[PDB]
Design a protein around this ligand. Structure first.
Ligand code: CA
Ligand code: CA
Length: 312
């Protein structure tokens, strides 16, 4: 498998468990610090990063009734400049740029207790696909599916329903949606970290997924595996292989990576393209920092880059 070694440029440093890199509608950059804790208790943070200086600004430090959050993944909204944040302790959160936030759900559409989330991905229809590797949200005791298969997948629909679409995963992590050239969502990719697998489903409609399949295989026997992911404009899936020192590049049909990207660190966690560019921002847990490098082409437009009233 061909490996490239692009130049990685330092963006910012010292962010415990640096995760969920994301750009909002105004081009501002955000990162979440899930592993920040106070007195042994979760006290996760959501930060804005000044790309010109690397200076960090904590805009939100979510907590619900004394229970601190563990924000781990983000997606920017289209109709409003707000962030949808997967929180390992609080479920799904909607965070405004002013730092205020709201907890989306304590229970799912079936009345079942909500599970802590890790990452999410908006499809072009506005539906949010979320991975939930943690156990029940606070106030319940914190648990995570690294050893046992109790990780679930959710779809937070346009009509405000939090629907569980699948369960029994051993730490569902990264997640992405593949669209047809005309914009129709048709495939969901879900990373299952410890098992070194990438799972796929056919998206038949909002919160409707069928034909679960082992779509891709993540290299290595190291502890870790597929973490964050995103598609480039040609629908190549770039996957952060935590603990392998590489970002795997899968072709449209999956299977084995068709290319690997060597990182100057052992633990790449998550990534995100800068709108209209080939620039990919990467967070890593060896140094707990954020970097950037140039990929071969532009990223696939995120939902926040599309237009609700666009003609084409
Ligand atoms: Ca993750
Ligand atoms: Ca991303």
């Amino acid at each position: 498998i061909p490996v490239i070694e692009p130049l990685f440029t330092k963006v910012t440093e010292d962010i415990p468990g640096a995760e969920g890199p994301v750009f909002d509608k105004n081009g501002d950059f955000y990162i979440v610090a899930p592993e920040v804790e106070v007195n042994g208790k979760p006290a996760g943070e959501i930060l804005r990063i000044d790309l010109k200086t690397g200076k960090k600004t904590v805009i939100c430090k979510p907590e619900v009734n004394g229970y601190g959050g563990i924000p781990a993944g983000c997606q920017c909204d289209r109709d409003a400049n707000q962030l949808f944040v997967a929180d390992m302790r609080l479920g799904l959160l909607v965070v405004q740029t002013d730092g205020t936030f709201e907890e989306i759900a304590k229970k799912d559409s079936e009345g079942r207790r909500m599970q802590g989330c890790n990452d999410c991905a908006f499809d072009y229809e506005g539906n949010l696909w979320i991975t939930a590797p943690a156990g029940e949200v606070a106030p319940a005791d914190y648990t995570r599916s690294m050893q046992e298969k109790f990780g679930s997948i959710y779809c937070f629909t346009t009509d405000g329903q939090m629907i569980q679409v699948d369960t029994a995963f051993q730490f569902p992590n990264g997640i992405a949606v593949r669209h047809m050239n005309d914009g129709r969502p048709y495939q969901l990719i879900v990373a299952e970290t410890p098992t070194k697998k990438l799972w796929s489903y056919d998206i038949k409609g909002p919160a409707k997924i069928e034909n679960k399949k082992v779509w891709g295989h993540i290299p290595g026997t190291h502890e870790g595996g597929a973490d964050g992911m995103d598609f480039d404009e040609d629908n190549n899936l770039l996957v952060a292989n935590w603990g392998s020192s590489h970002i795997e590049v899968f072709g449209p049909d999956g299977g084995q990576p068709k290319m690997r990207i060597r990182c100057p660190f052992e633990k790449p966690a998550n990534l995100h393209f800068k709108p209209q560019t080939k620039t990919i921002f990467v967070t890593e847990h060896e140094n707990n920092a954020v970097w950037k490098f140039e990929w071969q082409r532009n990223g696939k437009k995120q939902y926040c880059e599309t237009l609700k009233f666009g003609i084409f």
